[PDB]
Amino acid sequence: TWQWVLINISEEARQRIEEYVRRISKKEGTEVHFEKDDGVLHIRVKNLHEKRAREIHEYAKRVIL
Amino acid sequence: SSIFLLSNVSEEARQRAEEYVRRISKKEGTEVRFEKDDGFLTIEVKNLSEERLREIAEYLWRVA
User: Fold this and answer.
1) From A2, A5, A39, residue closest to B5, measured CB to CB
2) In chain A, which residues have their Cβ closer than 8 Å to the Cβ of B4?
3) I need a surface site. Which of A20, A64, B3, B25 has the fewest CB within 10 A?
4) CB contact under 8 A, A7 and B7
5) How many domains does the structure of chain A reveal?
6) Which domain holds residue A45?
7) Closest among B55, B37, B40, B43 to B17, alpha carbons compared
């Protein structure tokens, strides 16, 4: 289980990250839970491998930048 | 595992963010990793309670 807490990110970056995680969760057969507050985006992915987590984290920094 | 990602934070704010999480992980006995990548600060904690996770999220949001 991997949880991301993205702080004060763009609305377009949040959209690209959510869609990227949903595609990864669909192909891996797991489900992802999103939570949104003002400036804080929660992403909780059950049963995620370690290489997938690093990939999601690198893509997050790519689109948030 | 929980991953806190901050963007364009000052080194002043980076020290406060890291110091806050360290004593939390020091009290719970959990692994914590701090990684800097240009204007990004990654705070990765393992097996941290959601009660503590919301605390860190509220502090980092007030810091950022």
Assistant:
1) A5
2) 5, 7
3) A20
4) yes
5) 1
6) 2-64
7) B43
